[PDB]
Every structure is written in C-alpha cells, then in structure tokens.
Design a protein around this ligand. Sequence first.
Ligand SMILES: [Cl-]
Length: 31
Amino acid sequence: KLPPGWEKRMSXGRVYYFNHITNASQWERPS
Ligand SMILES: [Cl-]
C-alpha cells in the first residue's frame, strides 16, 4: 500500500511516483 496521495504513474513504459497532496514526484517507490 502506497502512503496517502501517492500514485504510481507512467514515465514511456517506465514508472514514477507522484503525490497529489504535495505535487512532489520521485523516481523510487516511497518506503
Ligand atoms: Cl502509510
């Protein structure tokens, strides 16, 4: 389960993680 706000999204055939609360993005999955 990702923490609140976090969505796994598409980078072309890759993924990244976006947080809808803070608009932060990061490449690695949140811990
Ligand atoms: Cl959590």
